[PDB]
Amino acid sequence: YEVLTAEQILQHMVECIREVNEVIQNPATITRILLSHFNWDKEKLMERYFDGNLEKLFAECHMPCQICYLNYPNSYFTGLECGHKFCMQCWSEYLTTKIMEEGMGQTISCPAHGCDILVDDNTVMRLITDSKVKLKYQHLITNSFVECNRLLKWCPAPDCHHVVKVQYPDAKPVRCKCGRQFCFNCGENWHDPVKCKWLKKWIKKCDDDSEAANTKECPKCHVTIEKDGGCNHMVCRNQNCKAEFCWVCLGPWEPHGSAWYNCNRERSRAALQRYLFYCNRYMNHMQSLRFEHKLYAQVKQKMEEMQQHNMSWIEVQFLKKAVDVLCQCRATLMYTYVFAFYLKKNNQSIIFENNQADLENATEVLSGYLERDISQDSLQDIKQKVQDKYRYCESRRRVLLQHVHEGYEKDLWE
Ligand SMILES: [Zn+2]
Ligand SMILES: [Zn+2]
Ligand SMILES: [Zn+2]
Ligand SMILES: [Zn+2]
Ligand SMILES: [Zn+2]
Ligand SMILES: [Zn+2]
Asked: Which residues carry this modification: N6-acetyllysine?
C-alpha cells in the first residue's frame, strides 16, 4: 500500500493532462473534461479527434465592480478571457458558494454566466481563500481520474482527501495515515469476519429504519447512569449499590465470562425484534469504540510522563499497541454481528458463538483496564497486566477468525 495526498493526485493528474496536450493545445481545464468524456482511457480519446470532426467530440462533452458595485485598485480585479474582472472577494464568494452547493458539474463558468467560458482550474485554485474548499474542488475535479482508474481508491472518510494506491485490488486492509482503516474493494471500515455483499446488505437495512443509547438506569439501585467509556463493565456510583453489571444487557457481573451466561444470544413482527437485538450490539459497540479513540490522546501523555521517570521509548511503546489491539478487537467485534445476524442457528453458528463471547469479554477486560483501573497500579505491575491482557485479546481474534476463514471455505450457513 502507498499513501498519497490530494495535491499529489491533482499534480500527478496535471502531468497526465499536460503531456497529452500535444497536440490538443487546449488548456489543462479542457483536456480533463475530454479525458473524462472518453473516461481516462487515453488512446480511445486521441483516436476520436483524428478520424473525424472534433466539433462533434466537443459537443458530446460540451471602473466599478459588477457584483458588489464599487471601485477598487486595478490589482484587486482579476479577469477571465471573457473580459470581465471583479473583486478578489466577489470571486472567492461566487466561487465558494457555487462549489459547495448544489451538486454541480466539473466546470464553474463565468460569473456573469451569460459569458459562460469556464474558469480554468488553476485560476479557481488561486482565487478561493478558505483552504477547506480548495480541497473540495481538488477532490471534485479529480474524482474522475481516481474513479476511472483501478488501484486508486479514495479514503472512505468524510474529512480525508488522501487516496490509497495498490498494486492489485485484492480486498485486504489498508491504513491511510488517517488513521482510518478500511476494506479496499468496497470502501467500508475494515470488516474481517463479514462479506461485502452481506455488510452492504445492512447499510440498506440500517438506513431502512426511520427512528445509540446515551444513558441508562441501574438495575440495582435504579439510579440513572450516563455512558462514558469505553468498556461495558459498569460500576454505578451511589453508596446504595456496588453493582457492578453489564451495559448492553442489564444483568450482572461477573457471570460474564462464565459459561452459564450468554451475552450474545404474528411472525410478521418477529423479524424487527431480533433485528433490534442484533443491531443494538452493533450500535453500542460503535459508541464504545468511539470513546476508545480518545485513549490515543491520553496514551501520548502516559508514555511521555512515564518515560522521563524510568524507562526507554522501546520499552513504553507496548502501551500504544494495547490501544491498537483494543481498537482492532472493538472493530472486529461489531462486524461479527453482521455475520451472526444472517447466518442462522446452524451447528457452525454455535461454535462461533463461543469465540465471540470469549472475545467480547476479552475486550472488556482490557478496555476496562486502560479506562480506570490502570492509573492506580504501580509501573512494574501495570506493564505485566497490559501485556497479558492484550496478549489474550490478540490471540482470541486470530482464533476467532481462524474459524471464520475456514467457515466460508465450504459453505456452512446463511
Ligand atoms: Zn466586488
Ligand atoms: Zn465573462
Ligand atoms: Zn483518510
Ligand atoms: Zn468490504
Ligand atoms: Zn446502582
Ligand atoms: Zn452483558
From this structure: 42
Q: Any known ligand binding at 236?
A: yes
And the C-alpha cell for 74? 486595478
Give, as residue ranges, everything with CB less than 5 Å from ion ligand 6. 246, 249, 263
The secondary structure of residue 317, as a DSSP letter, is T
Type of residue found at 234: M
Beta carbons of 114 and 89 less than 8 angstroms apart: no
- The whole-angstrom separation of Cα 143 and Cα 1 is 20
Q: Is 206 annotated as a binding residue?
A: no
Cα separation of the two ends of the chain: 33
CA of 102 to the centre of ligand 1 (A): 23
Instruction: State which approach was used to obtain the coordinates.
Output: X-ray
Q: Are 40 and 145 in contact (CB under 8 A)?
A: yes
Instruction: Tell me whether residue 241 is annotated as binding.
Output: yes
Domains of the chain, start order: 1-190 (no CATH), 192-412 (1.20.120.1750)
The closest of 248, 212, 276 to 363, measured between CA atoms, is 248
